[PDB]
Backbone:
């Protein structure tokens, strides 16, 4: 194994939230890069509302991609422009096609991959940025590559990311690093659409329970005070 | 006039030297009702089909209005549940509840009811540890000769785990808390003829007091700590105990490199994993649990408690090392630095219970001449 | 069972006061803290040393396991 | 027995809970003592108190005018029948002339009472029974005797 | 009771053949051969 | 040497710090309920006040001052005469029935 | 004192007692949410929607 470090974040703090601006560029990445071979099936464009995009804007992406829906009255099926209810475009219809599109290897889903891998983000960010030349005395089949963070240090992961592989909207640098930041910020949101709200109840709880707990502890000590101050004696003849 | 039976929770005699430990004795009533209450609303959107169950969980955590909390108030609630028990039960040893033979046995049947229940609760979402978590444990029942293959295939609904295995648990799992809900009353009934049992172990009949002002709020104070320690985890570290892998979809054609069920088996699972033999450890497993029914024939001291048996405390807190060790040693893999431990720790468990705690009272009686 | 027919008592007096006529937390810091320490000094010696070894066995359990995966000179 | 007027007394005769009880009103300079004394067996204490407090809260809140006229006409025959002779007369005199200052004539005791109605009682009992910090005592098999906290929690209706 | 990998019990590292016979590992036996029959040179009845 | 230990272990139990005795900490079975029931009032009542106060202090986790503590030499064996008397009748009750 | 004058008015009678609570609780609700949210905004300034709710 290899243990990733504890890289800080804009959300590591126990009352820290996600930089939604970072998410906004993060979603660009999945569509331009990862959506060719990663099947995020547990998400739709509508969940991006109130998070990174708006109704009409995100809907513009549903108009962009075609989706297989609707039994025609002829008895056949067709393609339409998607909508906000529609989940993401699945790259490939089944897993086996993905194994066929690769060197026998499968891409996992990326919906809950963060919470389904030790370290979560810090694994992933260091995974992409852990590519290096293989060491001496190592050999690998074609298609496989080297990355220390992956178990076995042997993976059919083509390098997906590199500096100036694409460009973003507002125009921030398309480095291998900043891109790697927004994307891991993006995936944590995948398996946690509640982060913005978890901390909110994360905070309401304390200033109640921190406030009640003395009072109940007093009402306890209030009633018990009869016995916390009770004396006795023994007066037979 | 069903108002006279509810005096046992209002106007009941009970002692006055009572610690904060016995908060835990009633939190289960709060864990159980809460857990049921949570899970019941939770199953409003569960589905008992392989093709949709894992997704049907995702139907909750994403699309339901504040339902995502309910996955964790329930799930990690089940961890806080067990945290009560092994603080509820080791109590009875450190204080001597176990002389109440009619009650102590009831305290076992709950545990096997639950630990076989919870085993059916981790498996529903098809986490890739659900499957193998159900495979390994259930596979062991093939250890028996001439029937092991039958009952296992019989419970698998075939020759291996499948959709048919799932639904058969979901009903067996949605139900037993209600069976516990009534057995809870039974567990309090045999109590009611004798009442509670102080830390000193002395029959405190002279100093039994009311219940509505004093221990009610005291339990509520504990429930607050429970809800606190529960609200903390769900809000701040819900991924802590619930292993990461269980968010993976199920696939029989691939395993993780490391297997472990949920943390709470691990004191027990390690005992089996210690034994290289298959069957030779299985009977030790349930024996490790069912020893509790066998302890009260080993109350050697004509005292009761252990606040007044200092040597017992030297052993008792040593037992906790073994459990908390087997907890950790269980959740770690099979290699030479760890096998050497469980081959001892397993024996230590049976050893501390059946040799040295009896040996104490046989001595402590002699140290004070009776 | 209830109050009334438990046992016998003779020549015993009980004094006690309302809660309202006394502070809830008097002498909490002033008197409690020694009593905490006194409660501590009677229990630590029969509770800690198991956990002391646990911390060590938890230590050596990793180090030996840590070395074993590291290679040998051959 | 059952036919009596005090609801407390009727129940005590009905189920034979107690054997005797009395009330009082002591007067000292800036204070006194209001309360009662009752006498029962160890398997009946809790219920008498529950009924007893059940009467005080009743008068703090719900005091029937006709029931007031009962007691107004009790107290007249009390002080008068108390004053049957000479020695009781000089008990009052030698006592009033250290406490009240003057003596109070009986025509004055009456006029004070005639001002009374249930509006007054609901103010007074609310002032001295309701939610106060009572004083308790007991000498005997008090095994059933509840705690001062429960007793006070039984002091205020609702 | 886990899944060995072909060219091998990963969670214990138990070296097998392509035929599946154990060479090295905690695995006590060579793996389970089920009963079967070949109707022809291109089809199978596994059982 | 032995006798130093009985005094020592007697101090480590702690019940000499709560004004209690050896006999008071006994487990209760039917054999002993008889014996307790057989005890005289002058001594029986003296059992309860020892117990009754130790409870109130176990509530607080408090103890008594060093002077009030119990001494080993005063750890009277007031109960053993009544006790072994009983089991002398128990064993006769059984072996005679055999 | 404020404590005593409070007692005679509200906490004395039970029918009055519950009146204070839901009333104050209602007025308490309006404040507690405003206290938390602003602080949650105060911490994570320049991160939330309402701080980008003007660009679009
Ligand atoms: C060229 C197609 C392709 C692209 C583009 C791609 N992936 Fe991969 N991904 C794969 C394949 C194939 C695997 C299989 C790895 C294996 O079999 O071990 C994989 C594996 C993974 C895993 C599994 C890690 C684990 O612990 O199991 C993650 C996470 C992942 N990719 C994320 C990403 C990220 C992040 C990017 C963009 C930086 C990306 N993918 C772009 C094809 C791709
Ligand atoms: C002692 C009683 C129970 C135990 C030990 C237990 C155990 C568990 C656990 C640990 C989970 C976690 C699954 C996860 O986090 O993903 C779970 C899930 C679940 N529980 Fe139970 N449970 C109990 C009672 C109940 C009850 C009373 C209900 C319904 C009333 C219920 C219905 C469910 C359902 C539908 C799930 C699937 C949710 C999920 O997997 O996330 N369980 N159970
Ligand atoms: C849902 C499960 C359970 C419920 C609802 C429950 C309920 C209770 C309650 C309310 C008490 C009184 C509180 C106290 O004594 O401190 C109690 C005591 C006790 N419990 Fe539990 N309990 C449960 C599980 C168990 C288990 C698993 C055991 C295992 C041994 C057990 C054994 C005992 C014993 C021996 C007592 C006696 C207390 C004494 O001796 O003073 N109970 N139980």
Residues:
């Amino acid at each position: 194994e290899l243990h990733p470090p504890s890289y800080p974040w804009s959300h590591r703090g126990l009352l820290s939230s996600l930089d939604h601006t970072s998410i906004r560029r993060g979603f660009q990445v999945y569509k331009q890069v990862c959506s060719s071979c990663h099947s995020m099936d547990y998400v739709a464009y509508r969940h991006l509302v109130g998070v990174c995009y708006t109704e009409d804007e995100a809907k513009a992406l549903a108009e962009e991609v075609e989706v297989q829906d609707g039994p025609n009255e002829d008895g056949e099926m067709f393609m339409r422009p998607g909508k906000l209810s529609d989940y993401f475009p699945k790259p490939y219809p089944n897993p086996e096609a993905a194994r066929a599109a690769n060197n026998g290897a499968l891409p996992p889903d990326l919906s809950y991959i963060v919470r389904a891998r030790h370290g979560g983000e810090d694994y992933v960010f260091s995974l992409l940025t852990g590519y290096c030349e293989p060491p001496t005395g190592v050999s690998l089949r074609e298609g496989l590559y080297f990355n220390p963070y992956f178990p076995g240090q042997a993976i059919g992961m083509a390098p997906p990311i590199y500096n100036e592989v694409l460009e973003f909207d507002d125009g921030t640098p398309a480095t291998m690093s900043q891109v790697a930041k927004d994307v891991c910020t993006f995936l944590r949101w995948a398996a946690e659409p509640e982060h913005d709200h978890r901390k909110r109840m994360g905070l309401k709880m304390l200033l109640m329970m921190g406030l009640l707990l003395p009072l109940v502890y007093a009402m306890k000590r209030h009633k018990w005070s009869v016995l916390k101050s009770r004396k006795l004696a023994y007066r037979p003849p | 006039l069903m108002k006279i039976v509810n005096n046992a929770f209002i106007d009941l005699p009970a002692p006055s030297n009572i610690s904060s430990w016995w908060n835990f004795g009633s939190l289960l009533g709060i864990c159980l009702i809460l857990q049921i209450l949570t899970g019941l609303f939770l199953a409003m959107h569960y589905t008992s089909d392989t093709t949709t169950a894992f997704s049907s969980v995702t139907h909750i955590c994403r699309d339901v209005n504040y339902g995502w909390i309910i996955r964790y108030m329930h799930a990690n609630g089940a961890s806080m549940f067990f945290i009560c028990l092994y603080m509820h039960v080791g109590r009875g040893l450190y204080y001597g509840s176990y002389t109440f033979l009619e009650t102590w046995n009831i305290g076992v049947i709950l545990l096997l009811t639950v630990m076989a229940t919870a085993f059916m609760g981790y498996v529903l979402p098809w986490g890739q540890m659900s499957f193998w978590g159900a495979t390994v444990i259930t596979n062991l029942l093939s250890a028996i000769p001439y029937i092991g293959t039958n009952l296992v295939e019989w419970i698998w609904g075939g020759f291996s785990v499948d959709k048919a295995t799932l639904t058969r648990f979901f009903a067996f799992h949605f139900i037993l808390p209600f069976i516990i809900m009534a057995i809870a009353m039974v567990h309090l009934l045999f109590l009611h003829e004798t009442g509670s049992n102080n830390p000193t172990g002395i029959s405190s009949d002279v100093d039994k007091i009311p219940f509505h002002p004093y221990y009610t709020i005291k339990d509520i104070l504990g429930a607050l700590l429970l809800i606190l320690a529960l609200m903390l985890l769900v809000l701040f570290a819900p991924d802590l105990l619930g292993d990461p892998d269980n968010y993976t979809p199920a696939n029989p054609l691939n395993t993780p490199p490391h297997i472990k069920p949920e943390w709470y088996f691990l004191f027990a699972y390690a005992i089996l994993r210690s034994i290289p033999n298959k069957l030779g450890g299985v009977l030790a497993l349930a024996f490790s649990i069912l020893i509790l029914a066998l302890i009260p024939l080993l109350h050697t001291s004509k005292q009761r408690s252990m606040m007044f048996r200092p040597l017992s405390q030297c052993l008792f807190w040593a037992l906790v090392a073994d459990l908390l060790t087997l907890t950790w040693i269980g959740g770690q893999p099979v290699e030479h630095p760890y096998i050497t431990i469980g081959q001892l720790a397993s024996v230590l468990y049976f050893l501390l219970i059946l040799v040295l705690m009896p040996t104490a009272g046989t001595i402590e009686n002699k140290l004070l001449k009776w | 069972r209830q109050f009334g027919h438990l046992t016998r008592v003779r020549h015993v007096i009980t004094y006690s006061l309302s809660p309202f006529e006394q502070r809830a937390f008097p002498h909490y810091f002033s008197k409690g803290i020694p009593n905490v320490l006194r409660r501590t000094r009677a229990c630590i010696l029969r509770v800690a040393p198991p956990f002391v070894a646990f911390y060590l066995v938890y230590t050596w359990g990793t180090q030996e396991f840590e070395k074993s995966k590291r290679k040998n000179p051959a | 027995g059952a036919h009596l007027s005090s609801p407390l007394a009727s129940i005590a005769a009905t189920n034979k809970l107690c054997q005797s009880f009395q009330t009082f009103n002591i007067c000292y300079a800036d204070t006194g003592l209001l309360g009662a004394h009752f006498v029962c067996d160890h398997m009946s204490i809790d219920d008498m108190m529950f009924v007893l407090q059940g009467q005080w809260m009743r008068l703090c809140t719900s005091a029937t005018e006709s029931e007031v006229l009962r007691g107004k006409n009790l107290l007249r025959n009390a002080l008068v029948s108390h004053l049957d002779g000479t020695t009781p007369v000089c008990e009052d005199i030698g006592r009033s002339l250290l406490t009240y200052g003057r003596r109070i004539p009986l025509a004055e005791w009456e006029s004070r009472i005639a001002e009374v109605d249930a509006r007054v009682v609901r103010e007074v009992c609310s002032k001295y029974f309701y939610d106060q910090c009572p004083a308790v005592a007991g000498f005997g098999p008090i095994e059933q005797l509840p705690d001062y906290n429960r007793i006070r929690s039984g002091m205020f209706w609702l | 009771g886990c899944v060995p990998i072909a060219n091998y019990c990963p969670c214990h590292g138990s070296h097998y053949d392509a035929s599946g016979r154990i060479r090295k590992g905690p695995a006590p036996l060579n793996l389970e051969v089920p009963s079967y029959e070949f109707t022809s040179d291109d089809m199978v009845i596994v059982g | 040497w032995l006798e130093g230990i009985r005094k020592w272990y007697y101090n480590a139990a702690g019940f000499n710090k709560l004004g209690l005795m050896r006999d008071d900490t006994i487990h209760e079975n039917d054999d002993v309920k008889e014996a307790i029931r057989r005890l005289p009032e002058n001594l029986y009542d003296d059992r309860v006040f020892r117990i009754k106060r130790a409870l109130d202090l176990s509530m607080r986790q408090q103890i008594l001052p060093k002077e009030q503590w119990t001494k080993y030499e005063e750890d009277k064996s007031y109960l053993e005469p009544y006790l072994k008397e009983v089991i002398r009748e128990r064993k006769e009750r059984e072996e005679w029935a055999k | 004192t404020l404590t005593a004058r409070l007692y005679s008015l509200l906490f004395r009678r039970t029918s009055t007692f519950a009146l204070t609570i839901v009333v104050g609780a209602l007025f308490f609700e309006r404040a507690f949410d405003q206290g938390a949210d602003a602080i949650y905004e105060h911490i994570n300034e320049g991160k939330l929607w309402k701080h980008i709710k003007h660009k679009y």
The beta strands of chain A are 66-71, 77-81, 230-233. Chain A has two domains: 1-193, 194-237. Chain A touches chain F at residues 227-228, 230, 232, 234, 236 (CB under 8 Å).
